[PDB]
Design a protein around this ligand. Structure first.
Ligand SMILES: OC[C@H]1O[C@H](O)[C@H](O)[C@@H](O)[C@@H]1O
Ligand SMILES: [K+]
Ligand SMILES: [K+]
Lengths: 256, 256
């Protein structure tokens, strides 16, 4: 009643063959970040946490040097290495001025083959829908895309948060992401700010009007169109986009 | 509020040890061309402005002799000798019929050594991404490369401007180049016409399919793959391609 066993994987595409005993509250929320350790967390594609992610004042901090998607130095996106299917995630997030990050969900670790048969690790964001994290006032991406669909709590490049009720940079915002049987809801500061349905025609259409369309990015389209793969499941994680950001009170409720 | 100090260098690879006071507007655009002088400007690789660059009717003008890439007489590319990193450039350009120029950004002044240890000044474009300037209706290059990737506002030979909304020759076009933490956007006539991201595998992949691939041109590969050198910064400038072209309303906003 106090704890639940949560399986996790240790390296790229590995079985979840170990478990953590993690606290669960009266309402079924599992605390997945203990404020002290990266137990069950690892870099996307890796068997360790990149050193640019640290733990400070009971937060996961990304320590950013400003190269956008470059993921220079010892970076990369971070996942909690337990695949969820139907779940509700709540967490606090705070971005630096001009900052950019993101909360991924239903992520898969994807590789492609190069021309000579070597592996290429593909970005998490071409399998995983992204809840944007952004300083909506100073980062230029805020003004790109359509209808502010690149502002915080948007489904990135697809659906804007309405209302756009983000608190400004350097302040704690609350996120929610619920996926239940294909229904997806994003929450920002305790309001629902968009909703959508996976694996439907409307899903497909949103993808085709995005940077992940079949003609702009064929592999992304394919992965995202059948989001979560054959089993409709994947990781939560957070983005290395080069900028200081903090995450705390990271909690997940398993739905069924 | 009305001006800001802008450092600039006087000669090849020199420190920016002198400063101009340049007007800034309320949006933080710095006017880098004052309509009247070449202050802060110099030939790429030079300590003076080549005499084929003149000021006429409030514009910076290239006076061309028609030798294409030859750069014959007292020509050469022109830089504003202040390195920028995160910035948004806006300027207007007009071409002669059949004309060709370009707008470089993140440029470095590069030399190599010959076989006897002498210096060879390398072209601006082995380091600097090129926003194509072109009479897309009359210059043959327009129909080359791939999917109109040598038309105006393209990332030259690499990404086409879409939509291709150039005005005809002899008419003013508006350009925009924004580099923010590696994200690059080109604008033409107030539409955003391409977006990419420096220092990614996607960037490497574009280079590898280009004339500056590692196999074809290793030095250019190395410089552009790490565009902007170890500090990811470099010059704005414009191209001598042998043809009359006019540039005006040149403003840069520094972003952080
Ligand atoms: O690729 C760099 C340069 O090479 C050639 O000189 C092209 O004619 C010109 O468009 C381009 O600016
Ligand atoms: K993001
Ligand atoms: K050109």
């Amino acid at each position: 009643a106090n704890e639940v066993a949560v399986s996790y994987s240790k390296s790229l595409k590995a079985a979840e063959m170990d478990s953590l005993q993690l606290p669960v509250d009266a309402d079924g929320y599992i605390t997945i970040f203990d404020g002290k350790t990266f137990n069950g967390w690892r870099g996307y594609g890796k068997d360790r946490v990149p050193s640019k992610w640290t733990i400070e004042d009971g937060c996961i901090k990304f320590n950013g040097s400003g190269g956008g998607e470059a993921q220079d130095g010892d970076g990369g996106d971070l996942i909690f290495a337990h695949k969820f299917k139907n779940f509700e995630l709540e967490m606090e997030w705070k971005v630096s001025k001009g900052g950019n990050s993101g909360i991924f969900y239903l992520a898969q670790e994807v590789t492609s083959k190069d021309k000579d048969g070597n592996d290429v690790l593909e970005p998490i964001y071409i399998s995983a829908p992204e809840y944007q994290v952004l300083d909506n006032d100073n980062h230029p991406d805020a003004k790109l895309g359509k209808d502010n669909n690149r502002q915080s709590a948007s489904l990135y490049d697809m659906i804007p948060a309405v209302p756009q009720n983000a608190k400004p940079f350097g302040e704690w915002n609350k996120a929610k992401i619920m996926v239940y049987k294909g229904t997806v809801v994003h929450g920002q500061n305790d309001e629902n700010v968009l909703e959508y349905h996976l694996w439907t025609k409307q899903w497909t259409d949103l993808l085709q009007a995005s940077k992940f369309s079949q003609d702009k990015w064929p592999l992304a389209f394919e992965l995202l169109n059948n989001c979560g793969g054959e089993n409709h499941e994947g990781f939560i994680g957070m983005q290395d986009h080069g900028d200081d950001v903090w995450f705390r009170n990271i909690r997940v409720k398993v739905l069924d």
